[PDB]
Design an enzyme around this catalytic site. Structure first.
Site, PDB file in Angstrom:
ATOM      1  N   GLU A  35       0.717  -1.160   0.028  1.00 40.78           N
ATOM      2  CA  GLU A  35      -0.085   0.105   0.141  1.00 40.78           C
ATOM      3  C   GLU A  35       0.808   1.278   0.106  1.00 40.78           C
ATOM      4  O   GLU A  35       0.605   2.072  -0.654  1.00 40.78           O
ATOM      5  CB  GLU A  35      -1.020  -0.041   1.223  1.00 40.78           C
ATOM      6  CG  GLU A  35      -1.753  -0.955   1.144  1.00 40.78           C
ATOM      7  CD  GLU A  35      -3.323  -0.766  -0.039  1.00 40.78           C
ATOM      8  OE1 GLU A  35      -2.851   0.345  -0.603  1.00 40.78           O
ATOM      9  OE2 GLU A  35      -4.014  -1.512  -0.062  1.00 40.78           O
ATOM     10  N   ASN A  46      -7.573   9.349  -5.435  1.00 39.35           N
ATOM     11  CA  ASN A  46      -8.463   8.483  -6.106  1.00 39.35           C
ATOM     12  C   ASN A  46      -9.129   9.136  -7.154  1.00 39.35           C
ATOM     13  O   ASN A  46      -9.413  10.532  -6.946  1.00 39.35           O
ATOM     14  CB  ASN A  46      -9.309   7.826  -5.316  1.00 39.35           C
ATOM     15  CG  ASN A  46      -8.596   6.819  -4.192  1.00 39.35           C
ATOM     16  OD1 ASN A  46      -8.523   6.996  -2.908  1.00 39.35           O
ATOM     17  ND2 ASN A  46      -7.621   5.912  -4.822  1.00 39.35           N
ATOM     18  N   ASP A  48     -12.470   9.344  -7.538  1.00 36.27           N
ATOM     19  CA  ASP A  48     -13.647   9.975  -6.887  1.00 36.27           C
ATOM     20  C   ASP A  48     -13.416  11.165  -6.274  1.00 36.27           C
ATOM     21  O   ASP A  48     -14.419  11.717  -5.668  1.00 36.27           O
ATOM     22  CB  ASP A  48     -14.385   8.838  -6.188  1.00 36.27           C
ATOM     23  CG  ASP A  48     -13.656   8.653  -4.880  1.00 36.27           C
ATOM     24  OD1 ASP A  48     -12.437   8.805  -4.868  1.00 36.27           O
ATOM     25  OD2 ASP A  48     -14.204   7.698  -4.252  1.00 36.27           O
ATOM     26  N   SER A  50     -11.565  11.431  -3.609  1.00 37.54           N
ATOM     27  CA  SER A  50     -11.129  11.006  -2.391  1.00 37.54           C
ATOM     28  C   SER A  50      -9.516  10.753  -2.270  1.00 37.54           C
ATOM     29  O   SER A  50      -9.002  10.679  -3.385  1.00 37.54           O
ATOM     30  CB  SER A  50     -11.859   9.692  -1.456  1.00 37.54           C
ATOM     31  OG  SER A  50     -11.572   8.584  -2.550  1.00 37.54           O
ATOM     32  N   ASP A  52      -6.379   8.497  -0.213  1.00 39.00           N
ATOM     33  CA  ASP A  52      -5.667   7.475   0.563  1.00 39.00           C
ATOM     34  C   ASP A  52      -4.391   8.045   1.353  1.00 39.00           C
ATOM     35  O   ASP A  52      -3.698   8.577   0.828  1.00 39.00           O
ATOM     36  CB  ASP A  52      -5.440   6.326  -0.042  1.00 39.00           C
ATOM     37  CG  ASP A  52      -6.631   5.603  -0.822  1.00 39.00           C
ATOM     38  OD1 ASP A  52      -7.506   6.001  -0.541  1.00 39.00           O
ATOM     39  OD2 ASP A  52      -6.444   4.999  -1.905  1.00 39.00           O
ATOM     40  N   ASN A  59      -8.720   5.682   3.434  1.00 41.30           N
ATOM     41  CA  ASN A  59      -9.255   6.413   2.361  1.00 41.30           C
ATOM     42  C   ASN A  59     -10.398   7.465   3.122  1.00 41.30           C
ATOM     43  O   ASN A  59     -11.195   7.379   4.003  1.00 41.30           O
ATOM     44  CB  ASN A  59     -10.199   5.419   1.390  1.00 41.30           C
ATOM     45  CG  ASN A  59     -10.849   6.305   0.297  1.00 41.30           C
ATOM     46  OD1 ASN A  59     -12.017   6.612   0.376  1.00 41.30           O
ATOM     47  ND2 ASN A  59     -10.088   6.802  -0.458  1.00 41.30           N
ATOM     48  N   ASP A 101     -15.316  -4.481   9.465  1.00 46.85           N
ATOM     49  CA  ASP A 101     -16.697  -3.827   8.893  1.00 46.85           C
ATOM     50  C   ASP A 101     -17.326  -4.732   8.044  1.00 46.85           C
ATOM     51  O   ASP A 101     -18.361  -4.435   7.427  1.00 46.85           O
ATOM     52  CB  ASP A 101     -16.117  -2.714   7.835  1.00 46.85           C
ATOM     53  CG  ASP A 101     -17.422  -1.909   7.633  1.00 46.85           C
ATOM     54  OD1 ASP A 101     -18.101  -1.496   8.391  1.00 46.85           O
ATOM     55  OD2 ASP A 101     -17.313  -1.400   6.258  1.00 46.85           O
TER      56      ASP A 101
END
Ligand code: NA
Length: 129
Positions: A35, A46, A48, A50, A52, A59, A101
């Site tokens: 990562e 990203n 969209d 957003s 990280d 995120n 989650d």
């Protein structure tokens, strides 16, 4: 801070990630490697809008607030910048919430594509833990 492999393993172990929700330490070190290349300051945008953040690339759409991701949630209740600290505590506490989650570590695309189903124990081999 750029961690060494075993240095990170030990830090994560100390923070209770070893077998957290059934994921051995090797899984967490592998995910971090791919990562962020063990760099707590890693950021990546990203498509969209957003972003990280940090060693586990958490995120901003869901987990932290960076003040520039419209309509996002802040489920770990932290500024995203706290995820970039040399102290991995905030990253680890937020990761525990993420992995709980429902989808487990599959939430980390790099873990799914590059660690899952591999010999992850190799990532902690030789470390004094
Ligand atoms: Na957010």
């Amino acid at each position: 801070k750029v961690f060494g492999r075993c240095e990170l393993a030990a830090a994560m172990k100390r923070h209770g990630l070893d077998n957290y929700r059934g994921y051995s330490l090797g899984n967490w070190v592998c995910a971090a490697k791919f990562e962020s290349n063990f760099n707590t300051q890693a950021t990546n945008r990203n498509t969209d809008g957003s972003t990280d953040y940090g060693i586990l690339q958490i995120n901003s759409r869901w987990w932290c607030n960076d003040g520039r991701t419209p309509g996002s949630r802040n489920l770990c209740n932290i500024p995203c910048s706290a995820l970039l600290s040399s102290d991995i505590t905030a990253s680890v506490n937020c990761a525990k919430k993420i992995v709980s989650d429902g989808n487990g570590m599959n939430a980390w695309v790099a873990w799914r594509n590059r660690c899952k189903g591999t010999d992850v124990q190799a990532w902690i081999r030789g470390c004094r833990l």
